[PDB]
Amino acid sequence: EVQPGNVTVLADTAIRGQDLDEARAMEAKRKAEEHISSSHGDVDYAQASAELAKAIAQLRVIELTKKAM
Amino acid sequence: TMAEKFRDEGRDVLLFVDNIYRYTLAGTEVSALLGRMPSAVGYQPTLAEEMGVLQERITSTKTGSITSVQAVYVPADDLTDPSPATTFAHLDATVVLSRQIASLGIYPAVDPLDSTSR
Numbered sequence: 001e002v003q004p005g006n007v008t009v010l011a012d013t014a015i016r017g018q019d020l021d022e023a024r025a026m027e028a029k030r031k032a033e034e035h036i037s038s039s040h041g042d043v044d045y046a047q048a049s050a051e052l053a054k055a056i057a058q059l060r061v062i063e064l065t066k067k068a069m
Numbered sequence: 070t071m072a073e074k075f076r077d078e079g080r081d082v083l084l085f086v087d088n089i090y091r092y093t094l095a096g097t098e099v100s101a102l103l104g105r106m107p108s109a110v111g112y113q114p115t116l117a118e119e120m121g122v123l124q125e126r127i128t129s130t131k132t133g134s135i136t137s138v139q140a141v142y143v144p145a146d147d148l149t150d151p152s153p154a155t156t157f158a159h160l161d162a163t164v165v166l167s168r169q170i171a172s173l174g175i176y177p178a179v180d181p182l183d184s185t186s187r
Contacts, residue, residue, distance in 0.1 A: 068172050
């Protein structure tokens with residue numbers, strides 16, 4: 001887009017065609033019927049969550065101290 | 070003894086005992102003066118025999134029956150103290166009340182994960 005004293009180029013991140021996008025559409029449609037739920041890759045959250053799950057396991061704290069709740 | 074007289078007459082009786090813990094506590098208060106060595110938490114050495122010699126004669130029989138309800142104070146809320154611990158065995162239905170429920174206002178403060186019945 002060119003204006004008289006300004007110009008801007010609204011670029012794209014990946015090659016955009018017709019048949020390129022239809023492959024993406026078909027893959028996204030497949031993954032919804034076949035329940036292929038892929039995993040994220042946040043390894044920090046994976047480790048923190050697993051340590052937090054183990055540490056809190058069978059603590060029985062609330063039975064031990066007499067909080068009413 | 071009163072309840073047993075009514076039972077032997079062939080009747081069927083109700084016997085309510087307002088705190089049976091105080092029988093064992095009065096036994097403790099006097100045990101050491103009788104010259105008997107202390108046991109687990111200062112309790113008399115004959116705790117379980119004193120307790121059984123009573124709870125065994127409060128029972129129904131082929132001639133007449135006694136229903137009963139006994140309040141059993143548990144000291145310091147410690148359900149593992151020797152005195153409640155030896156009494157649990159002598160009951161058919163045990164109802165355990167708890168302070169951490171009564172403080173919620175939920176009366177009767179029965180603990181349903183600890184009450185049980187034969």
